[PDB]
Amino acid sequence: ISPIETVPVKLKPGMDGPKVKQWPLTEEKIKALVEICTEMEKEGKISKIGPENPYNTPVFAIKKKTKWRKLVDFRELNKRTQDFWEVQLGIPHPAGLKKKKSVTVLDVGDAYFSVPLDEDFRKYTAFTIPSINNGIRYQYNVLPQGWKGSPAIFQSSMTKILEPFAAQNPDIVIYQYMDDLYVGSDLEIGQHRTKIEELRQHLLRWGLTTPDKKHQKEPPFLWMGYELHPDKWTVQPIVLPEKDSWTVNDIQKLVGKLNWASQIYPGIKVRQLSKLLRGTKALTEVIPLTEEAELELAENREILKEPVHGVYYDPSKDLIAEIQKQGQGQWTYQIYQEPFKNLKTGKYARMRGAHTNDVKQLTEAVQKITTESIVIWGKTPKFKLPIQKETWETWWTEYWQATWIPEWEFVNTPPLVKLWYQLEKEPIVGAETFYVDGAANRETKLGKAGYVTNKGRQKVVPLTNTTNQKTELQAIYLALQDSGLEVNIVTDSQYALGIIQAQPDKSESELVNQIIEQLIKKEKVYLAWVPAHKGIGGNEQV
């Protein structure tokens, strides 16, 4: 079976072929391996070879509990073989598929064995079936199963094979995934079956068999963790385990399944569980479950109680994205064309820092959605967002970092994204000026936070088990606690200055959160910085 051209293959430079010996396993499977190898010899898939290849790869035979399968271990050869263009990893997302009147699934059997292997490379595929006294030598003429080059070379071969058929049939759309072909068309059912038959025979001319019966797979289709119905898609049912104790492995699989659920079931929250997964220690140990994680999990269970589906994609209809706040640090989004019919859903939980605010997270969510949309639909969607032009404009104008804000429309669906507070850009007249400082002995971890004001008020609060940074935040917090609704605060800490000027409404540290509550309760707050250890109102202490 020459007509398929062979891809040239080389070993890695400086490397020879595998000499690894056959491991007996003198068990009766020998004869099995004979029978199979005779059949494959009849079909020209393999060949007996002269006494000097010289090379070897281990061959095995088994039946998992009637048939017998030959399994060759190509690991050593695979390490010694050149890389090939990476075979398809990413799969088409169901939400990106365009609805077709008829869809057929074609599994080609013995896919790899139907494609010839490069002649000069065949000697390296040699294997031995053991004689009882000590054997018969064989080599592959086709792409072996388990070999490094098989998927990419078969992929290429299949593409080239498919070109002439697709050329004369532009109205039918063919997806190629591994061995499978998925063939859609809008043609009448009869002539669709006809076109399928044509494709089948065309493939048969290249030595590729397709399902002979009325094709083995019927709607719906279980494919890569999905259910594909003619009019809709969804995910295969997600079963969340119930345990008293959880290891880090269990939590990884849990957040995995939940992540998988998030693309369709709206409202999924993974954050607190991955917070549990912040421990990287090798995956054995029992990880303590936090109340927040338990709550999160329970809510997820309540969401997964109801059945949910997505729809398929129409290029003529607009692409629309909508975003809602899920509570602390967490967001959820829906992508749809028809208003209540979701193409898909998702989430954004990421802080990407110890502190952030709502608008920043929203903008990041928009970014993630944009990327995903480009990947799946090859275009960016329209955004319906729960934020007002004034809010966002003020934010991105006063934001030091460059940002891209799309065309969007304000939808009013509380909670609305808002600025909980805004620091003053100018010092406040009539407001008390707090000169703050804090310090800690790095050895003893003991510290203090204090202020002196222009009204003549001075205070010092003692602190235990703390650092200079935390004390410098502590001082600011202290000045917030003891002042009126309007306050001027002066600090020598670049750290604290950086944290507050960023205007976070949420944080990992409870100290910063307290500071945020204070800032919200305030009306006017101005933060100013001065260089430390120069003549200044606030002075210094130890």
Place this chain on the structure above:
Amino acid sequence: PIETVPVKLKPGMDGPKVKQWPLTEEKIKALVEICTEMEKEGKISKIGPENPYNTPVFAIKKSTKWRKLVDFRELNKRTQDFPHPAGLKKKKSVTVLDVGDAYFSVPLDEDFRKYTAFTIPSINNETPGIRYQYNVLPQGWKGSPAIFQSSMTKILEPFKKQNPDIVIYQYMDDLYVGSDLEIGQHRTKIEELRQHLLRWGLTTPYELHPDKWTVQPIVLPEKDSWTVNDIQKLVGKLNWASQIYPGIKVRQLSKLLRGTKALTEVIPLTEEAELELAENREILKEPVHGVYYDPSKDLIAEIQKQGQGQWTYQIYQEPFKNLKTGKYARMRGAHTNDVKQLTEAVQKITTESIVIWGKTPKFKLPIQKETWETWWTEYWQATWIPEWEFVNTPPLVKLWYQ
């Protein structure tokens, strides 16, 4: 052209493997058209699975026609074999010309061609991408101007003979032509060079003024009435500049604030403090001592957003030593955004850097990674691409370089 220049990679190093970035349907369409035509013209050829290598490609508008830009940064890093005039920056006018098309006249070393492999991506992973490699010298590859160098010398020789005072420097796909001539004369000579290039079969389908380029002097505020907050800002800024300029003193200025005063309190400048401030204004006029360019070290460009369409930048090698500083501005017209201005600024800084040192700086970009990676090709008109990374550095930086 039949004789190919053999090209090698630095010992113990393989070809580039780099992820192709997802693209919109439009850009993919454009790339498919372009690559179809290029394949018909023999410039590129389809390749099989036996080629592991990949290089990113993008579609940019540079006219209405789509252009294909290949990002060769990795291949450029991994492949080197083999001058910059110092007078180019002194010239009154410098014009840039795209000579890249010429590279398509020269075939590429066969054994090396596989390292030029690139992929036109598919939407939603419907198909594996369309894979090509280059049969000729690709634009953006640093081997191209090196191999074409003798031809370029041959073509330019008569012109240089005719115009001895005109400077011509080549970087990548670009010719930089400086002159001290009057603008009209300059553009006339430029056009002469253009037609000279065209009639010899070199296709050339942006003028600077490096004479005006300078390192920004630090500017101190001028006020009729000074508050405590103002003098605090002043002292902080002068303290920052004190590292760079040794003579600066804050004592008399800080004396006015000496303790426990309200921020909004108006503080008059005493003649001593005003003396100190004036002296500091005077020392800020002179350039910094001991700042020299090192060709063996990476150039580094930091940018910060000043708002209202203003952006400031610094080019340095080692911290606090500034080879150049500048400020870029754009008239908004309500069309503009942050990404556009940042991209433009990056291109301008890179051009300035090429003109002055003959190399591109490593950029520290005040933007989110994914946002830049998404939108940067929209406004990018340049044939080359700089290295870049992404940082914030807000806290004291905006106010000081403002």
